[PDB]
Each structure stands twice: as structure tokens, then as C-alpha cells.
Write a protein that binds this ligand. Structure first.
Ligand SMILES: *C/C=C(C)/C=C/C=C(C)/C=C/C1=C(C)CCCC1(C)C
Ligand SMILES: CCCCCCCC/C=C\CCCCCCCC(=O)O
Ligand SMILES: CCCCCCCC/C=C\CCCCCCCC(=O)O
Ligand SMILES: CCCCCCCC/C=C\CCCCCCCC(=O)O
Ligand SMILES: CCCCCCCC/C=C\CCCCCCCC(=O)O
Ligand SMILES: [Cl-]
Ligand SMILES: [Cl-]
Length: 269
């Protein structure tokens, strides 16, 4: 459906290129589901005020892990090794599924940051609202732009610019709330949380770069690079980010007198 609107459909792949993509996607599944079990086990050491932040990482792990799994299966469904190359057999592969999944996962990532920032009540509700709207604005417009990556690069760029406005405004909201709420943070996490900001600015910026690959590297190796970029970006923005969020949740929990948190940190000290 969208499969012919993505540059992946244009090319035959060497076994090397094809299998590297398959393995990237598969390693990403393994990383997400491994991290899942960690987040799960460690949630008992998080105080009730913050426990939802760790639960949101579990949710993101399974959500992203399922899309990666699905991507790996669709990739192998779409191509068969015919006459010395992987050649397109049918219209099962599209990057569109990621974009659709971000509608759920980006709001989860954002919400767990707000939680550990100690926002509550009306401020939590209003901040999450504006952020989710700005995130949906960005994803929807990017989703549309990406439908033109084969036959209209100008259109890809302009939907991209529009998506970028949303991104920039969401980042402004994120950064403002981070920098204005640092002083509420317990246990030294005032310092940790600024590294979370930077990690997000880094990892999230990789996605617009992946998006632009059709404009600067429209060939089978740009297809590989795009998946590589997604892979680096997924693990950074979801796994590493989630581990830092969970660190911050446990650390604040212990500083606030939650005994299982204290015992957990004490027994790794
Ligand atoms: C786990 C997934 C995450 C954190 C996804 C993040 C996606 C973005 C920050 C996407 C950004 C885009 C632009 C700013 C412009 C081009 C279109 C997008 C949607 C790729
Ligand atoms: C921060 C997350 C790290 C992401 C892990 C990515 C793992 C692979 C890293 C480098 C491999 C580079 C070698 C690629 C050879 C390409 C083969 C080919 O395409 O012909
Ligand atoms: C657009 C939809 C926005 C829904 C916002 C979700 C709010 C998360 C929890 C905050 C709360 O209910 O106090
Ligand atoms: C790719 C583009 C990268 C864009 C922005 C962020 C990169 C820098 C992150 C460094 C960490 C800074 C810090 O911890 O103070
Ligand atoms: C070399 C690549 C570095 C990759 C970093 C990986 C995982 C780190 C994230 C876990 C959070 C640790 C808490 C930080 C702290 O103790 O202050
Ligand atoms: Cl609590
Ligand atoms: Cl996702």
C-alpha cells in the first residue's frame, strides 16, 4: 500500500545488505525485550509516586519491540533471493508502521519524563496535553511527508519543515519544564535530568536525519543507513532513556524515604 511510496521498493539487495537490515531489526527486538524484563523486575523498588514512569518503559519496550519484530518479518516477507539478489516479491514493507507507532510511544516517553520531574495535578495534565498535541502534529505531518519519498522530494521536504516546527516547539516545552523543575529533583537527580534533556535532543534528532535519507542517499546503501539510524535512535531514545528515567525514579524514591528503593541502591553500593 505505502510499500511503493518508500524507496526500499525501488532496489534489489545483496545478501549482505538484506541480512544486515534483518539482523539490525532482530537485535533491536532482543534489546527491547531484554530491557523489558529489567524494567519489570526493578519496578518494585520504585515508590508509588514514580512507579508509572517505569511501567511506561515496559509499555514502550513491548510497543517498539513489536513494531521492530513486525518490521523484520515484513522485510523477509517482501523479498526473496532470486538470481543472486533479494528482489521484491510483494507489498508488505513500509516504514509507515513506525510512524503510526510513534503516536503511542512518543506520548509514553514524554509522560514518564513529566512524572520524574515531579509534575502533578493540573500542570501534569495541561503539560502532557500540549506535548501530546505537538508530538501528534509532528508525527502526522512526517507520516504524510514520507509518503512522497519516491515521487516528490520537494513535498517530503515541506511536510518535513512543518513537522520540524512541531518538533521544535515540543522540545521547547520539554526543555523549559526540565530546566524550571530541576530544583524539585531529589537525590542528585537535578543533575541527571539535564543529561536526559541532551540525550533526547540527540537521539530524537536522528529521526529527521533518517527521514531525509531519500533526499541525500537514494540507493540501497541509504536504505541500510536509514535502518541503522533508526536502530541507534530507538535504543538511545527508548532503552538508554528508559534506564536513565528508571535510575531517576529509584534515586528519587530512596531520597523520599521509600525503603525498597533504599535497599535496592544500598545493595549495589
Ligand atoms: C521511539 C521513537 C521516537 C523517540 C521517535 C521520534 C521521532 C521524531 C522526533 C520524529 C521527527 C520528525 C521530524 C522532526 C521531521 C521529519 C519527520 C519526523 C516525524 C521523522
Ligand atoms: C547505540 C546503538 C548501536 C546500534 C548497533 C548497530 C550494530 C552494527 C554496527 C556497526 C556495523 C557496521 C558494519 C556494516 C557492514 C554493512 C554490510 C553491507 O551493508 O554490505
Ligand atoms: C490529547 C490527549 C491528552 C491526554 C493527556 C494525558 C494525561 C496524563 C495523566 C495526567 C492526569 O490525568 O492528571
Ligand atoms: C545529531 C545532532 C545532535 C543534536 C543535539 C545534541 C548533541 C549533544 C549531546 C551532548 C550531551 C551534553 C550534556 O550532557 O551536557
Ligand atoms: C559507550 C556508550 C555509552 C552507553 C551508555 C549506556 C547506558 C547508561 C544509562 C544508564 C543510566 C545510569 C545512571 C547515571 C548515573 O549513575 O548518574
Ligand atoms: Cl510515593
Ligand atoms: Cl516506536
Amino acid at each position: 500500500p505505502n510499500s511503493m511510496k518508500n524507496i526500499e521498493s525501488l532496489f534489489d539487495y545483496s545478501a549482505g545488505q538484506f541480512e544486515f537490515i534483518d539482523h539490525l531489526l532482530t537485535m533491536g527486538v532482543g534489546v527491547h525485550f531484554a530491557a523489558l524484563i529489567f524494567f519489570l523486575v526493578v519496578s518494585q523498588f520504585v515508590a508509588p509516586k514514580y512507579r508509572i514512569a517505569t511501567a511506561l518503559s515496559c509499555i514502550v519496550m513491548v510497543s517498539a519491540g513489536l513494531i521492530l519484530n513486525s518490521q523484520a518479518v515484513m522485510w523477509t516477507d517482501a523479498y526473496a533471493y532470486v538470481d543472486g539478489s533479494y528482489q521484491l516479491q510483494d507489498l508488505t514493507f513500509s516504514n509507515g508502521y513506525r510512524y503510526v507507532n510513534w503516536m503511542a510511544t512518543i506520548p509514553c516517553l514524554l509522560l514518564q519524563l513529566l512524572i520524574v520531574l515531579n509534575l502533578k495535578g493540573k500542570e501534569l495534565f495541561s503539560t502532557a496535553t500540549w506535548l501530546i498535541l505537538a508530538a501528534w502534529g509532528m508525527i502526522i505531518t512526517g507520516y504524510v511527508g514520507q509518503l512522497y519519498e519516491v515521487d516528490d522530494i520537494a513535498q517530503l521536504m515541506i511536510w518535513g519543515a512543518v513537522s520540524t516546527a512541531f518538533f521544535v516547539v515540543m522540545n521547547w516545552i520539554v526543555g523549559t519544564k526540565i530546566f524550571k523543575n530541576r530544583a524539585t529533583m531529589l537525590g542528585g537527580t537535578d543533575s541527571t535530568i539535564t543529561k536526559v534533556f541532551w540525550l533526547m535532543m540527540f537521539a530524537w534528532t536522528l529521526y529527521p536525519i533518517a527521514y531525509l535519507v531519500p533526499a541525500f542517499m537514494n540507493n540501497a546503501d541509504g536504505v541500510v543507513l536509514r535502518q541503522l539510524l533508526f536502530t541507534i535512535a530507538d535504543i538511545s531514545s527508548k532503552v538508554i532513556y528508559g534506564l536513565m528515567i528508571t535510575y531517576i525514579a529509584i534515586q528519587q524514591s530512596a531520597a523520599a524515604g521509600y525503603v525498597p528503593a533504599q535497599q535496592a541502591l544500598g545493595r549495589i553500593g
